[PDB]
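User: what does the whole thing look like in 3D?
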Amino acid sequence: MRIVINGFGRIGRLVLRQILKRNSPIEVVAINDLVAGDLLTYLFKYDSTHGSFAPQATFSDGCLVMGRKVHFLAEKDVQKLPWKDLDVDVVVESTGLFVNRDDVAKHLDSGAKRVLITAPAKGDVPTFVMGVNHQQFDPADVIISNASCTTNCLAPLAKVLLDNFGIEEGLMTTVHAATATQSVVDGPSRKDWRGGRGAFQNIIPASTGAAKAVGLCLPELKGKLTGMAFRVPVADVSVVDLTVKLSSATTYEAICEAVKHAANTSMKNIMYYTEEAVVSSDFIGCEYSSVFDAQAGVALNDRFFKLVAWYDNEIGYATRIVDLLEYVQEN
Amino acid sequence: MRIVINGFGRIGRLVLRQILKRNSPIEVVAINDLVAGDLLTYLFKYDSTHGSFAPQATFSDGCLVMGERKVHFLAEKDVQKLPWKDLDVDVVVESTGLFVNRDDVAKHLDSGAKRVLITAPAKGDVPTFVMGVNHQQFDPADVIISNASCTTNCLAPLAKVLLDNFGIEEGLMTTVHAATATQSVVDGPSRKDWRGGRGAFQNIIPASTGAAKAVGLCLPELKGKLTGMAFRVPVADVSVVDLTVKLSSATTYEAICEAVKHAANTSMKNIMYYTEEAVVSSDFIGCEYSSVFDAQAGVALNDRFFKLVAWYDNEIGYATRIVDLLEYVQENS
Amino acid sequence: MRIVINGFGRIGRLVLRQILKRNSPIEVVAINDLVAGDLLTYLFKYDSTHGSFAPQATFSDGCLVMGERKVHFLAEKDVQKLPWKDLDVDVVVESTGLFNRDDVAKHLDSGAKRVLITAPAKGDVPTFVMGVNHQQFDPADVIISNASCTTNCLAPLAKVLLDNFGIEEGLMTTVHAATATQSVVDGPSRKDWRGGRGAFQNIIPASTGAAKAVGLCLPELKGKLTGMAFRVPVADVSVVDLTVKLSSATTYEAICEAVKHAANTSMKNIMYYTEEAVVSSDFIGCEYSSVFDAQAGVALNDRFFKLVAWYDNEIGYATRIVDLLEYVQENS
Amino acid sequence: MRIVINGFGRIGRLVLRQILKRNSPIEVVAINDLVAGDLLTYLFKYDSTHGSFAPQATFSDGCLVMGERKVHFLAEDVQKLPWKDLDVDVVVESTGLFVNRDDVAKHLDSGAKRVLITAPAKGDVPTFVMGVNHQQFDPADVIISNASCTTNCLAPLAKVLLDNFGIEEGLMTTVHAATATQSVVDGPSRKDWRGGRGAFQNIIPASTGAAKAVGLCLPELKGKLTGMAFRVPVADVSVVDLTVKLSSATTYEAICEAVKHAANTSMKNIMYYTEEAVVSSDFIGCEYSSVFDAQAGVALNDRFFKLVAWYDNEIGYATRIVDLLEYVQENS
Ligand SMILES: NC(=O)c1ccc[n+]([C@@H]2O[C@H](COP(=O)([O-])OP(=O)(O)OC[C@H]3O[C@@H](n4cnc5c(N)ncnc54)[C@H](O)[C@@H]3O)[C@@H](O)[C@H]2O)c1
Ligand SMILES: NC(=O)c1ccc[n+]([C@@H]2O[C@H](COP(=O)([O-])OP(=O)(O)OC[C@H]3O[C@@H](n4cnc5c(N)ncnc54)[C@H](O)[C@@H]3O)[C@@H](O)[C@H]2O)c1
Ligand SMILES: NC(=O)c1ccc[n+]([C@@H]2O[C@H](COP(=O)([O-])OP(=O)(O)OC[C@H]3O[C@@H](n4cnc5c(N)ncnc54)[C@H](O)[C@@H]3O)[C@@H](O)[C@H]2O)c1
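Assistant: Here's the predicted 3D structure for the full assembly of 1328 residues, as structure tokens:
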């Protein structure tokens, strides 16, 4: 399977890393970004959050060399990308700028067979969450979205609850790590004023569509969930706090058993169940979409619960991108 | 009224700061801590969070000298050895964080204090008060009282406004809370909450809180109707309450905003504040309100299920409430 | 004096703040930035580091409105379309961090009387530091530089040392607060790879010209100083660590006395002298260029010393910008 | 060799981690600390800085059980520690409380053969730095010190410089990660007022004796070095900034070549040499004592240089403790 990575940021680089951390047919043929390949190679090899990687990797003549040679490109506009000539099966669209189906289809015009957007999409782009609705994928879907890190944490938990107890209504908060859209010192962020305030000085409220996005993958939950976020000063790992009213009376123990059973069966490699006294740093490098924290949750009564689920918003999501690439593509 | 401050920490020092900032008639006779007065004076004058204060203050002859105020320093870890009889102490501000059971705190009364105000939730038959919510329930017979927690002081005024206007069926609260002195700079042991010892500025840290049940203490109509939890995160001050509430009456988000705004203009004056600005935690450093409703941050699922957001400076807002409660006790005992 | 502010970032906003905190005869007539005025007004009023300011300020009628002060917001990217002629602009405060004298002269082409660059300049730009060489300013200098925060901290101390003891050689480190050029998580920084690594996860080495730049305002020190920086996870306040070999034998105590006397006299309101157990947060809002930390320094012998001087790299520098503006207004 | 760990903090736990990581013949027979063993086991298995370790490890019957390793947990006053019953060859003294020789000798009174203090000591305690002077260890040395993290970073660099060029004088700064002596919010620290100010809000000046301890390990350098520290808001990894006046003229490149050569030969596994654009987080888990940062340093002239060397003050130091224990095991 021949892929390119457009946008070599946190997600693009860690997608490459996670590809290298498994046995996979994926062939990464090119990387496109706005800076030179020697700097991109440096950022791939040295990671403040996830530590060093690929010590033998080198840059030479615009190629990332690992044994594997990946072309580096630095071409601002899609019409100029050589996807036909590179025989590209999938573009990993990870710049964070192209979420419109019109902007992203220009990857297909320049010769790519499929595009995977590493973010919520604008418009009705088919959106998949592994372990929740990925079996709805149709080969005719030439532009697809892997949703957000937060939706990938919430949707599996919501599915377990829907399948065992029913959901009447839910309101989610994610206490979320700082991300590249934020600023080191107070600065302007036109489309999110709060998001420009100093990222490590502040708890910063943010809007999020991740809870509503669960209705895209679990149609029964459309209109039944919404939420918000607080951005906080950690560099990685986030947590979903789901306040949910269930459709039937249950106990906290029954919820734990339902989640533990799903993690052992239908949610294997997607959800994990823990009773340990965990904190955010314990999930750095965690590849699960959703880690249910049994000790942290609380029950008000037999229908009203507050549940806690962790996610490495960088590595868990990058791993899911790779899982979706392997699932959708042929050969 | 003659008070002493036992434990000259974040809360003890900022209680003194707020006493001085309103030129209060309270007499701070003595300060007790585990270290000498020169170091304590240094900490009172220089504050990483709230800036320098009282530049003319000096440590002199074992006292803190600030104008006409001269406060004796003590360094006696044992409550049974404190000279409260000899100092004619009306109220001990108990802010060490070590004495939480009512019988531990009563030791101050054995050593000669007339009354104790614990700057924290207490266990046992301790009345717990929140200014603007139930403080007029104070009785001169209450010789040991609690000002609850910072979080309870943020949630209870909001909970009262909702109860009075719409009714509350059930509520589940989270507080995203600043790191505090119970935490550690690097991974270390915390006997009562293992997670709480993990490096404070490396982690989002789940924690238990009793603030939701305590609202049921201040507002008996809400007994059994609220619970919640906390996440400690890497900021040095200011915290936020995230209240997911099912109301008894159908309403709109805008009507909730108007109810809070009206309360902040009337029955909750100086306790709750209402904003529509694009605020972040640092905007509340030095904020003296108990609860600042963040109108733009909240979300509505439907006409009865809402997520409401309220900020609090867990240091300065709470310290200001301590001074408010002290002056109230002074006027009603 | 009629000024405009080009670039409303940390420096631009805090220069406006300091002008207003000292209710100065400088008249601020316009702000140019490529962000809308409602957001810029928000950032001016709410500051994570320095607290809220000007609560009565509003964005209204395309202006920043504060009492009788009304400031036009502009969003003009080409320096020739700037209406400095019609606005009768005496000084452009150039604080974008993007503008090499050839580019900056175009402000005068569009009608401004003089330009003040809030950073080190390349080319034939006079460089001034208040309290060290700001009297070299000549009305014929239509483009001038206020140097860097770090140069404004090091040069006053260096002048006191040169005048009392002489300097043979010095090597400086500044342990510097994070700045807007840095990144929240690992990202690319073309001319400074380390500078793109997560700002609050790392101690980050950086190059600095501040020490060599001290030779501009103190020619006696040309070739005698260099240095480097470590960027660390604080949002503001930085500290100079100067290892210096002096030209005569002295004691640490005598160095403290030279600095204290200068802070009481020729360096008044420029340098400050403390013996308190200070830490960086104690200088948030500090307006001095350089605060000598008497307790922190060490002496190896009678000629070789390590001296420590603090500076609020935001507020101290902004205050020096305002001071230089007022000096330029009184002698122009 | 049978050892116990007194004080199961950052150093104590990571010493145990490094023993297990290299499947070492050292036998850890007991751990003493002031908290229960299930909490200590949790802290050993989950580490915010260095990640999880020993997933199969468990607390059982008052012991830490890891395979065949069964480590007694104690929670005890040095007077009643059961070193006689445990047949203890070495106490790893890692509490940070016992630094003077007579306090530490109470370990020998309670039955231990030898004590290794994981800190600079007070009194006639021989101090060793692996790769610098550890072969001076004598079996008669029943109380020894491994110096500090900082000394283990500075001394190898200083030895390379001394052997190749000579050192006339040096002033060192370490920009140091926050440690367990510091506080989350402003609190009292009797022996260091600045050290109690909020650790992640501040750059915090601190005293250090590491430069003078290098004179202990390299007597040729006694009196020629001193220095200071800044504590800054990172949870691990520190850097030495050494301003040095060498006795012979050289070039920066020749310094780089001398260090690179030492790292390949006499300092193998002690010093590392890099030319990469590194930042502090790149050294989390680094086991070397001193990592020379070739790109970061600067030269004023052919005798006066600023050299930069990194160290994981937790893991590098812990690894050196294990190295010294194995050396003592082979020479006692
Ligand atoms: N970081 C997370 O936790 C996370 C989680 C889930 C989803 N995502 C999504 O992944 C996407 C990328 O996020 P990120 O965290 O990697 O951000 P990032 O800023 O780290 O990465 C973006 C990269 O793309 C490059 N780029 C920008 N414009 C470009 C262009 N025109 N052409 C090519 N390259 C360009 C940037 O220089 C940068 O290297 C976003 O859409 C984000 O919403 C991120
Ligand atoms: N920080 C907040 O946000 C906050 C808010 C509300 C309530 N409180 C509560 O107030 C109390 C104090 O909290 P803090 O944050 O100020 O803690 P702190 O650690 O800052 O202050 C405690 C002080 O007590 C001193 N002390 C300890 N043992 C002592 C003893 N035996 N005798 C005398 N002094 C002693 C310590 O040296 C320290 O100065 C706790 O009960 C805490 O729960 C704190
Ligand atoms: N952290 C570093 O970077 C570093 C580096 C080199 C050397 N050191 C030195 O190593 C020593 C330990 O430092 P640390 O960082 O591990 O500190 P720490 O605080 O993390 O560890 C000390 C441990 O000892 C325990 N303890 C306290 N009093 C005790 C007693 N009387 N009996 C038994 N156990 C007791 C504490 O509960 C704690 O777990 C200190 O001398 C320190 O200077 C630290």
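In plain terms: Chain C has two domains: 2-118, 149-313. Helices of chain C lie at 10-21, 37-45, 84-87, 101-109, 149-164, 210-217, 252-264, 315-330.
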